[PDB]
Design brief:
Two copies of one chain form a homodimer. By secondary structure, chain A is an alpha/beta fold. Chain A folds into two domains: 1-266, Rossmann fold; 267-336, Immunoglobulin-like (Sandwich), CATH 2.60.40. The first copy, chain A, has ten helices and 15 strands. Chain A has helices spanning 11-27, 41-46, 68-81, 104-118, 133-139, 141-157, 165-181, 196-211, 251-256, 260-266, and strands at 2-7, 32-36, 55-58, 61-65, 124-128, 186-192, 215-221, 239-241, 271-274, 279-283, 293-295, 301-305, 308-312, 326-329, 332-335. Chain A has an eight-stranded mixed beta sheet, sandwiched between helices. Chain A has a four-stranded antiparallel beta sheet with strand order 9-10-15-14, with helices on one face. The first copy, chain A, has a three-stranded antiparallel beta sheet with strand order 11-12-13. The longest helix of chain A has 17 residues, at 11-27. The radius of gyration of chain A is 21 Å and the shape is globular. Chains A and B meet through α2, α4, α5, α6 and α8 of A and α2, α4, α5, α6 and α8 of B. Chain B: It comes from Nostoc sp. (strain PCC 7120 / SAG 25.82 / UTEX 2576). Chain B: This is All4481 protein. It is classed as atp binding protein.
């Protein structure tokens, strides 16, 4: 399915857009799952009590609320049942008492999304997340984990000759990496008011998202006390202005939403590898040139920007070949 | 030092409050460190470029931006030194700190460890932390308690100075003079309910919530009745870089934190646990009791209570809300 999410500084507006987007897509015949985190606004706006299990609220529209506590407890039931395939040690430890640590919360939620996607029951999964750098870190897990494996397995394996999962693991992560890089499978839209402070924040998130390979398909401009045409601030992306939702009337907002799928398909690609011209082009808007560092300390080239690091896995064509050069150009970092 | 932070759904308002609180405390002579995340608003509001190292912008006022990449690079070197002290044959010495990728969880851990180091340096009276103001902030602040539960539970299934390290963090988190947060919200009912939910979630980790800062919006209203018994302080906006009116309207954070409700008290004579849990219904709170431990789950946080002798081994006979407190009773007969 398509995992669709929103980045922006204000949670209330993003939850409203997620709800409207789900209502819109459902009414168009798409099978939709709307998923939110542990917070009261989604339930209240929907006038429906939510649970850790999907609930039908309209035709083609189901809604669920992720609770880290419950996802952890359900995964625990799987680890102790596996305690068979390998005397038990963790049987006096009950799922109800497990404590969610930072990081676990994002891994649990991404895995729940993965399960819903894998189920094939939905065309679109609208994720009402935190809409910030933390959502980006979560979405980039496949890539990040793949890199830790790729860089460290060698060091441990080829060092301790004193003492297959790799395929099973790399395959699992690659399938997540593949999906994430495909705009038909994962896309996010920026949400902001005309406040210069919100505009600079989402431009920064836009760039940070390109660093993890997340396509940003467009910008949704919501109302505020500051007026302004944001088009030139987000070129070449479409900025779609939308109205508020008051007193349960979702029609104006629903009718103003953009065509998510089309805009994601037309947006810039986070990364393009040009075999013929032997180069890699990284879309990096929303940063200051001096805020992008390119270095090669390990096997791969590291691109640092937006407090995110990208270790470029080069294909056979570019493999080993020295970096003849690199430069910026209309928000793209071109490396030769 | 007092670690002071703010919880609320709007980042720009929270950053403005954190900046004004820092300016105010530094102007009164408190040694202040204002620490923000890797985001462009703090630097812009202060009209100052920020870096991973504190920079003085006014007397008694330093500002620093936590960049997870840099914190990770810096801890990595400590990992290397450890490898050289504990291994005769290095293995990760090759990997440069600059190529490491930040994983979920690392950001919070690195951020809390940096705060712990500033706090341990003794150079500050207050560290104003401009974080995400949400459930992830709560999960970060409750790390001492969470790691302590793993260490103990997952060790009895068979690290000395470990408990000393964690304990210090736990003692600080529970002390209103050491760690406190204030809610920030407009009169919008959706924001009010989000903040009340965060308020109860904070109580679950033992984080004192000292009060409420009410900021402007298109919706007006008196919020006092929605946050009893907390003081709600109405503050003006900041325009043209004139911080003075906002600064002049801020409450006395330290005093409000000391007067706020206590997340938990145990009455050993009547055999009851009293938990302050505003923002939650009986339907939204689950209790589990295994042996000498009771788990309270609410607001997607879990408080694990190791029962003292007066309560241990006694069935729970009641768990009822009275004026925002959950009173859990234990069997006497």
């Amino acid at each position: 399915a398509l995992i669709l999410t929103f980045l922006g500084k204000s949670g209330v507006a993003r939850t409203k857009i997620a709800i409207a987007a789900a209502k819109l897509l459902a009414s168009q015949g798409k099978r939709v799952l709307l998923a939110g985190l542990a917070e009261p606004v989604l339930p209240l706006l929907l006038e429906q009590t939510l649970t850790p299990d999907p609930q039908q609220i309209a035709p083609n529209l189901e809604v669920v609320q992720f609770q880290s506590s419950v996802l952890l407890e359900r995964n625990w039931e799987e680890v102790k049942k596996l305690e068979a395939q390998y005397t038990p040690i963790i049987k006096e430890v009950y799922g109800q008492e497990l404590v969610v640590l930072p990081g676990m919360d994002s891994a649990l939620a991404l895995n729940a999304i993965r399960e819903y996607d894998a189920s094939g029951k939905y065309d679109t999964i609208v994720y009402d997340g935190t809409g910030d750098a933390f959502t980006l870190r979560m979405l980039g897990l496949p890539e990040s984990l793949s890199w830790y494996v790729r860089r460290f397995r060698q060091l441990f394996v080829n060092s301790d000759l004193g003492k297959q999962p790799t395929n099973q693991v790399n395959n699992f992560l690659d399938k997540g990496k593949e999906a994430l890089a495909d705009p038909k499978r994962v896309a996010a839209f920026l949400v902001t008011t005309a406040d210069p402070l919100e505009v600079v924040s989402v431009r920064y998130l836009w760039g940070s998202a390109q660093q993890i390979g997340l396509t940003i398909g467009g910008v949704i401009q919501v109302s505020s006390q500051t007026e302004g045409d944001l088009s030139a601030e987000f070129t070449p992306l479409s900025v779609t202005v939308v109205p508020d939702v008051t007193k349960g009337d979702w029609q104006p907002l629903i009718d103003a939403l953009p065509n998510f799928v089309e805009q994601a398909e037309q947006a810039p690609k986070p990364i393009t590898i040009d075999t013929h011209n032997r180069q890699v082009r990284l879309f990096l808007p929303g940063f200051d040139k001096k805020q992008v560092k390119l270095t090669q300390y390990g096997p791969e080239v590291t691109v640092e920007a937006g407090d995110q690091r990208r270790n470029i896995f080069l294909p056979p064509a570019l493999s080993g070949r020295p970096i003849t050069g690199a430069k910026f150009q209309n928000n793209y970092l071109i490396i030769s």
